[PDB]
Scaffold this active site. Structure first.
Site, PDB file in Angstrom:
ATOM      1  N   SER A   1      -6.583   3.476   2.873  1.00  0.00           N
ATOM      2  CA  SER A   1      -6.586   2.254   3.669  1.00  0.00           C
ATOM      3  C   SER A   1      -6.755   1.040   2.752  1.00  0.00           C
ATOM      4  O   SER A   1      -7.111   1.189   1.585  1.00  0.00           O
ATOM      5  CB  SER A   1      -7.709   2.314   4.717  1.00  0.00           C
ATOM      6  OG  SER A   1      -8.882   2.934   4.204  1.00  0.00           O
ATOM      7  N   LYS A   2      -6.528  -0.154   3.295  1.00  0.00           N
ATOM      8  CA  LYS A   2      -6.485  -1.386   2.481  1.00  0.00           C
ATOM      9  C   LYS A   2      -7.901  -1.866   2.141  1.00  0.00           C
ATOM     10  O   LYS A   2      -8.116  -2.424   1.064  1.00  0.00           O
ATOM     11  CB  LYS A   2      -5.627  -2.517   3.103  1.00  0.00           C
ATOM     12  CG  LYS A   2      -5.276  -2.432   4.591  1.00  0.00           C
ATOM     13  CD  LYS A   2      -4.111  -1.479   4.867  1.00  0.00           C
ATOM     14  CE  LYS A   2      -3.939  -1.195   6.351  1.00  0.00           C
ATOM     15  NZ  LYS A   2      -3.680   0.248   6.616  1.00  0.00           N
ATOM     16  N   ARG A   3      -8.847  -1.617   3.053  1.00  0.00           N
ATOM     17  CA  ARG A   3     -10.272  -1.916   2.846  1.00  0.00           C
ATOM     18  C   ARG A   3     -10.894  -1.018   1.754  1.00  0.00           C
ATOM     19  O   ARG A   3     -11.618  -1.520   0.889  1.00  0.00           O
ATOM     20  CB  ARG A   3     -11.055  -1.806   4.176  1.00  0.00           C
ATOM     21  CG  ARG A   3     -12.315  -2.669   4.260  1.00  0.00           C
ATOM     22  CD  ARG A   3     -13.585  -1.923   3.865  1.00  0.00           C
ATOM     23  NE  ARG A   3     -14.691  -2.842   3.570  1.00  0.00           N
ATOM     24  CZ  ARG A   3     -14.948  -3.414   2.387  1.00  0.00           C
ATOM     25  NH1 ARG A   3     -14.187  -3.185   1.314  1.00  0.00           N
ATOM     26  NH2 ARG A   3     -15.992  -4.234   2.270  1.00  0.00           N
ATOM     27  N   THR A   4     -10.614   0.291   1.792  1.00  0.00           N
ATOM     28  CA  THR A   4     -10.966   1.200   0.676  1.00  0.00           C
ATOM     29  C   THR A   4     -10.029   0.879  -0.512  1.00  0.00           C
ATOM     30  O   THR A   4      -8.919   0.383  -0.304  1.00  0.00           O
ATOM     31  CB  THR A   4     -10.956   2.711   1.097  1.00  0.00           C
ATOM     32  OG1 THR A   4     -11.671   3.500   0.141  1.00  0.00           O
ATOM     33  CG2 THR A   4      -9.560   3.276   1.234  1.00  0.00           C
TER      34      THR A   4
ATOM     35  N   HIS B   1       0.830  -1.203   0.000  1.00  0.00           N
ATOM     36  CA  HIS B   1       0.000   0.000   0.000  1.00  0.00           C
ATOM     37  C   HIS B   1       0.879   1.274   0.000  1.00  0.00           C
ATOM     38  O   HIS B   1       1.928   1.278   0.647  1.00  0.00           O
ATOM     39  CB  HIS B   1      -0.880  -0.108   1.251  1.00  0.00           C
ATOM     40  CG  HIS B   1      -1.610   1.133   1.607  1.00  0.00           C
ATOM     41  ND1 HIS B   1      -1.807   1.510   2.915  1.00  0.00           N
ATOM     42  CD2 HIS B   1      -2.198   2.079   0.844  1.00  0.00           C
ATOM     43  CE1 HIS B   1      -2.481   2.645   2.943  1.00  0.00           C
ATOM     44  NE2 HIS B   1      -2.724   3.014   1.698  1.00  0.00           N
TER      45      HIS B   1
END
Length: 465
Positions: A238-241, A15
């Site tokens: 973020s990794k979820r977004t 990321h």
């Protein structure tokens, strides 16, 4: 010495905010001739698959962030987490407890109702020499009852947090694996880490980790907690977004340094300076001086600084990276111009290396198609005459070159008492098939001697029909 680390919780890749974290941990070490280590949390045995951890290793590789030690794997240190908990046990500085998940909910329910933040009350702090079945077996750390813990965060300053509202955390699980907080302490300490640079979610954890260092009789690192990066719109990144993967910037065809420059400038500055070389960053960067408010993405800014370096860097530095984008399109490179020679021609016309390869393919393969509009610039016969003249002289001295073709083309436009306007216009359609390319000398040149001559004749035999 200085010892920093970058210990990412393996997802699918690196990321962009991890990249920045890693950059700062890398600079802080390099700057003082220090060591920069890399850890990998591969405890899941899924998620962390070899492709997932290679996507990190290759991401760091491409950016230029190299590590003196590692990658060192959490799986290799399972029994080391195990033994330090047992040491903490034997020393009476950690205990076992056996409350069920149902029992624990009862305590969250009894704690929240009082308007107090849920803790584990020290119900097993002084007792049982447990063990055995009861898969609720957890090892808990004896967190100091009263007082405070305080640290001089290099970014956020003095953080003081009270020992009330920090409970006796679980440090070792029933599945033979450490809780997050214990392991980072066991890791940082075993790896001599002196400066722990991380995002500001873990700021609440730092005091817990500090109290574990203290029980351990270990040097407490300096902490540096930074506001993690904001989405281009405004959401937190973020990794979820749907996060920006750093490798997508390699394929988008941004230069690597252009990006670490771009990254550095998110959340750090040096007065008015926007462009730093690799040295300028070693010499000027301080992790103290990172801005206490979160920086935001600006793909517009990235686009500019990428162009500056496209324009300003040695084309030989850029050559092999173009060859990355060129090779993607199916091109046989050995039978075309030099990448560097293309760089020079296109670097002021393009914003990315993928834009460049797309615009440069015409040089690297045959001339199968012509834009119909542009051929109605053979319209006259009187296109045959300038092209024939171009051709005559494009048999130039054995030095074939930008310059060499310019003069030849200048000498052809004169033999006809015409502007270079007229010799060049159709000649652009002859070797490109379109009305658009760089300045004619550059474009006639990029086809090579052979290629131009073939391309011109090809236009000529078409006009005679």
């Amino acid at each position: 010495a200085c010892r920093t680390r970058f210990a990412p919780s393996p997802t699918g890749y690196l990321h962009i905010g991890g990249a920045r974290t890693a950059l700062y941990c890398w600079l802080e070490a390099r700057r003082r001739g220090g060591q920069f280590v890399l850890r990998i949390e591969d405890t899941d045995r899924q998620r962390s698959t070899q492709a997932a951890i290679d996507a990190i290793l290759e991401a760091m590789q491409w950016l230029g962030l190299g590590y003196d030690e590692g990658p060192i794997y959490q799986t290799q240190r399972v029994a080391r987490y195990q033994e330090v908990a047992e040491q903490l046990l034997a020393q009476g500085k950690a205990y076992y407890a056996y409350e069920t998940r149902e029992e624990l909910d009862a305590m969250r329910e009894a704690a929240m109702a009082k308007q107090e933040k849920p803790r584990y009350d020290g119900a097993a702090r002084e007792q049982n020499l447990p063990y055995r079945d009861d898969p609720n077996r957890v090892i808990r750390f004896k967190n100091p009852i009263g007082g405070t813990v305080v640290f001089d965060d290099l970014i956020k300053g003095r953080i003081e947090i009270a020992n009330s509202e920090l409970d006796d955390m679980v440090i070792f699980r029933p599945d033979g694996l450490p809780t997050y907080n214990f392991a980072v302490v066991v890791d940082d300490w075993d790896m001599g880490i002196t400066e722990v640079i991380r995002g500001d979610d873990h700021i609440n954890n730092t005091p817990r980790q500090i109290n574990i260092y203290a029980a351990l009789g270990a040097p407490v690192p300096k902490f540096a907690h930074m506001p993690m990066i904001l989405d281009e719109q405004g959401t937190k990144l973020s990794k979820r977004t749907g996060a920006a993967d750093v490798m997508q910037y390699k394929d988008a065809g941004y230069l690597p340094h252009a990006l670490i420059n771009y990254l550095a400038r998110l959340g750090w500055s040096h007065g008015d300076q926007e462009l730093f070389t690799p040295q300028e960053l070693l010499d000027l960067f301080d992790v103290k001086d990172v801005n206490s408010k979160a920086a935001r993405l600006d793909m517009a800014k990235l686009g500019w600084v990428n162009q500056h370096y496209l324009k300003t860097d040695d084309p030989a530095s850029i050559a092999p990276q173009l060859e990355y984008q060129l090779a993607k399109l199916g091109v046989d490179l050995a039978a075309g111009p030099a990448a560097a020679d293309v760089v020079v021609a296109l670097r002021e016309r393009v914003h990315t290396l993928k834009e460049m390869a797309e615009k440069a393919v015409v040089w690297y393969q045959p001339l199968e198609t012509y834009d119909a509009a542009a051929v109605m610039k053979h319209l006259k016969l009187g296109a045959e005459v300038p092209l024939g003249k171009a051709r005559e002289l494009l048999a130039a001295v054995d030095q074939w070159s930008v310059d060499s073709v310019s003069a030849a083309l200048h000498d052809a436009a004169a033999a006809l008492e015409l502007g270079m306007g007229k010799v060049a216009q159709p000649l652009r359609v002859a070797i490109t098939g379109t009305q658009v390319s760089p300045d004619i000398s550059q474009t006639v040149y990029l086809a090579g001697r052979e290629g131009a001559l073939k391309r011109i004749d090809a236009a000529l035999t078409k006009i005679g029909a």
